[PDB]
Amino acid sequence: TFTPEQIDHLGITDTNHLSAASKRALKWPTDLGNEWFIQFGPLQPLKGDLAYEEGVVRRDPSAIIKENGKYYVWYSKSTGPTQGFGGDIEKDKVFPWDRCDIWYATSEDGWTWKEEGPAVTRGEKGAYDDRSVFTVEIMKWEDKYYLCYQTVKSPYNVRVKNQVGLAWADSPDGPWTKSEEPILSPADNGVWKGEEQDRFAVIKKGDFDSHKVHDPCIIPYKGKFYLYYKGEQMGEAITFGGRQIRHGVAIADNPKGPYVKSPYNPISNSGHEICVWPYNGGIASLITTDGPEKNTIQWAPDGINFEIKSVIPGVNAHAIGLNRTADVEKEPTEILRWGLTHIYNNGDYQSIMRFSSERKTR
Amino acid sequence: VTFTPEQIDHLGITDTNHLSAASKRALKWPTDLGNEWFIQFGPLQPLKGDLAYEEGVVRRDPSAIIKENGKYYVWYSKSTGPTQGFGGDIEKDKVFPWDRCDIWYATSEDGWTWKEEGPAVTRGEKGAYDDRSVFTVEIMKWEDKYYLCYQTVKSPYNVRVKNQVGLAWADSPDGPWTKSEEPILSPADNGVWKGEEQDRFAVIKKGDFDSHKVHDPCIIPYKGKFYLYYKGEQMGEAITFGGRQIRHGVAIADNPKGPYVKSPYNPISNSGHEICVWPYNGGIASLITTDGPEKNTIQWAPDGINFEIKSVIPGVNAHAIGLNRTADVEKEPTEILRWGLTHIYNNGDYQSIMRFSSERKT
Numbered sequence: 001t002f003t004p005e006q007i008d009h010l011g012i013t014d015t016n017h018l019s020a021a022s023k024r025a026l027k028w029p030t031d032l033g034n035e036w037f038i039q040f041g042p043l044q045p046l047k048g049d050l051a052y053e054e055g056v057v058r059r060d061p062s063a064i065i066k067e068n069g070k071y072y073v074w075y076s077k078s079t080g081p082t083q084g085f086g087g088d089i090e091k092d093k094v095f096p097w098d099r100c101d102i103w104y105a106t107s108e109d110g111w112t113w114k115e116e117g118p119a120v121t122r123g124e125k126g127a128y129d130d131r132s133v134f135t136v137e138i139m140k141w142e143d144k145y146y147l148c149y150q151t152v153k154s155p156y157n158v159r160v161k162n163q164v165g166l167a168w169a170d171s172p173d174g175p176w177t178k179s180e181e182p183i184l185s186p187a188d189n190g191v192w193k194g195e196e197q198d199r200f201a202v203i204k205k206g207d208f209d210s211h212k213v214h215d216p217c218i219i220p221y222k223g224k225f226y227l228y229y230k231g232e233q234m235g236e237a238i239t240f241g242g243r244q245i246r247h248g249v250a251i252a253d254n255p256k257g258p259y260v261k262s263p264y265n266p267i268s269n270s271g272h273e274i275c276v277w278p279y280n281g282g283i284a285s286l287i288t289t290d291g292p293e294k295n296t297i298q299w300a301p302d303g304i305n306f307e308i309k310s311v312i313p314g315v316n317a318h319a320i321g322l323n324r325t326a327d328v329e330k331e332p333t334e335i336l337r338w339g340l341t342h343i344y345n346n347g348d349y350q351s352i353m354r355f356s357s358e359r360k361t362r
Numbered sequence: 363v364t365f366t367p368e369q370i371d372h373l374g375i376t377d378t379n380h381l382s383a384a385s386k387r388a389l390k391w392p393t394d395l396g397n398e399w400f401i402q403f404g405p406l407q408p409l410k411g412d413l414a415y416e417e418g419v420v421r422r423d424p425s426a427i428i429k430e431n432g433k434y435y436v437w438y439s440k441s442t443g444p445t446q447g448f449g450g451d452i453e454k455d456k457v458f459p460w461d462r463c464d465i466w467y468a469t470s471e472d473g474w475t476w477k478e479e480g481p482a483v484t485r486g487e488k489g490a491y492d493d494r495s496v497f498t499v500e501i502m503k504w505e506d507k508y509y510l511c512y513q514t515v516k517s518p519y520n521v522r523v524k525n526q527v528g529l530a531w532a533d534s535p536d537g538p539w540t541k542s543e544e545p546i547l548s549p550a551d552n553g554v555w556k557g558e559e560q561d562r563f564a565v566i567k568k569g570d571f572d573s574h575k576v577h578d579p580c581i582i583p584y585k586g587k588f589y590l591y592y593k594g595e596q597m598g599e600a601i602t603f604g605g606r607q608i609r610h611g612v613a614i615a616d617n618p619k620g621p622y623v624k625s626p627y628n629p630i631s632n633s634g635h636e637i638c639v640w641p642y643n644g645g646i647a648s649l650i651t652t653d654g655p656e657k658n659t660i661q662w663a664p665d666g667i668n669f670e671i672k673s674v675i676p677g678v679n680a681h682a683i684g685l686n687r688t689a690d691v692e693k694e695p696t697e698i699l700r701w702g703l704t705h706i707y708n709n710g711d712y713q714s715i716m717r718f719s720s721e722r723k724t
């Protein structure tokens with residue numbers, strides 16, 4: 001099937017001799033415009049306490065909200081160099097996001113940021129979040145503020161399964177009350193092989209999130225709470241599209257849970273970081289980094305069934321913290337005009353950075 | 363919707379009664395496609411000697427590389443001075459960095475330090491089809507004779523000018539070179555401009571994918587004939603959900619000098635930019651970059667016409683690749699891509715040839 005208009009739009013030279021690629025091009029939706037297509041500007045440094053600082057990791061910025069005349073952002077913060085996993089795991093810092101707490105900063109212009117103080121810290125020895133609390137996002141509901149984040153219980157071994165903690169407050173400045181129990185855990189059905197600390201050696205891989213549940217982000221949606229997350233699997237494979245990473249959602253009736261994973265998981269087949277937002281009654285999601293559908297912006301009318309809306313150039317701003325103060329409903333990608341991100345200055349220390357993006361115009 | 367037990371497990375799908383839109387897309391992926399076309403490029407590396415960046419000089423769009431007389435040889439577009447663009451006197455200004463070019467060549471023993479030799483093919487006499495610029499060249503060696511094919515513009519270089527492709531040949535890789543008296547390829551003639559203003563977007567009819575331009579000509583001896591792969595630009599080109607509309611075609615001749623006849627199956631890509639193509643396993647492989655819904659893929663056609671996606675790879679930093687035709691291309695699909703030449707934008711006026719690497723992911 002095809003019209004004359006479609007043939008002309010596609011530049012197809014002979015409808016009696018359609019190449020494989022032209023056949024794929026004729027399956028693209030004809031009513032899908034260019035308004036999901038965007039390009040990022042160069043990453044820009046931040047001023048004040050969010051400038052690079054030797055000896056300190058500040059990374060993985062949350063979404064930004066505005067309260068009290070000020071932008072707020074939450075982020076992972078640790079100090080000291082990273083050794084990695086070849087030595088004493090009880091003693092060393094295995095990743096830059098090991099040994100973290102969650103701190104926060106505010107800004108009147110989104111450029112000069114004042115680090116205010118800790119928001120959420122590691123629990124006492126033996127608790128589920130004693131090793132590191134890190135990789136945070138922010139949700140507001142009915143005048144309360146919620147931070148969901150990754151937790152690790154010591155030791156931070158290659159094979160450890162992280163969980164997700166939740167903390168709440170009555171002001172964006174805290175103080176915050178942590179949940180006594182994690183709100184989300186990886187699947188329980190993988191099975192390791194042997195005793196070596198090797199995340200690739202398994203007897204059974206288990207579900208797509210049998211190892212890790214990452215980048216938790218909660219969107220109040222349809223009167224319920226949709227926690228989108230990234231699974232890593234035990235025995236993760238590399239495919240024609242790279243690392244095999246997929247996204248899930250878990251849904252709660254109330255902010256504090258219980259969050260029950262959707263039978264439709266995984267709700268992506270690709271991606272890495274979680275970057276999602278409600279738009280026109282549904283949920284938009286930027287899929288990046290890994291997988292056959294990396295570098296796409298996707299949209300689900302029901303937060304579950306995502307369709308490709310654009311295929312964009314490789315995205316330079318990783319782990320985006322979305323500008324939630326934007327006029328999100330104006331345009332599918334209005335929320336992405338600016339926001340926060342980070343950059344690997346070096347293997348030990350990273351810093352938060354600001355990005356911009358624009359639609360392309362002829 | 364079909365599936366097998368083994369697909370469901372490979373894809374990490376949690377429940378076959380509740381398949382997400384994304385999970386259903388993943389079920390269409392070919393189940394016998396391994397991960398051996400998946401690669402990552404390293405960072406661009408500068409060249410030494412005369413192919414170091416040189417303020418005031420453009421050297422760009424490196425041809426594929428061959429080895430003769432003990433040295434690697436490369437041909438490229440070379441011009442001098444700033445670019446004015448299209449807002450001035452077209453007859454006298456330099457409208458693009460690749461305007462006012464001749465084709466030059468360099469040699470090197472290690473592929474790192476390059477000595478610029480001299481002009482290989484220069485603009486023709488005032489009024490000839492190639493008087494304005496000769497640029498964007500490829501090399502092909504056939505039965506002891508060397509062939510360059512390149513783009514040509516006849517002055518004036520207006521927005522709406524249609525470039526063509528010229529061909530030259532020599533008995534030695536140092537030349538002297540003899541040019542074809544006529545061009546060997548031209549853009550489609552079925553587009554219709556709208557208005558008299560120089561505006562490549564204003565059309566009554568767009569015509570074929572290659573109605574405005576026929577770019578990056580590259581000839582591959584194949585099945586005893588000569589397959590000239592090229593990138594079309596289209597009169598009235600749109601920005602779509604995948605960005606600029608850019609597609610590739612092929613034109614086939616019985617003999618190196620032509621006549622080249624366009625395949626009825628054009629276009630044989632639905633995305634891409636500069637041509638980067640190589641023989642492999644009795645078929646043809648193609649690196650699709652920069653633009654379109656299938657950008658950042660490597661594809662392969664068993665017949666040089668019907669290409670299928672073999673990998674989806676991280677955003678490709680090396681455009682306009684000049685492939686290593688000395689590589690043992692049949693050894694594995696991406697063997698040829700271990701190293702080669704490309705270019706980079708130093709600024710809007712000057713570009714430089716660079717060296718790239720890639721590696722299969724572990």
Ligand SMILES: [Cl-]
Pocket residue numbers: 150152161162212
């Ligand atoms: Cl983790």
Ligand SMILES: [Cl-]
Pocket residue numbers: 513515524525575
């Ligand atoms: Cl041109």
Ligand SMILES: [Zn+2]
Pocket residue numbers: 060061062135136215319320321
């Ligand atoms: Zn994040």
Ligand SMILES: [Zn+2]
Pocket residue numbers: 423424425498499578636637682683684
């Ligand atoms: Zn080229």
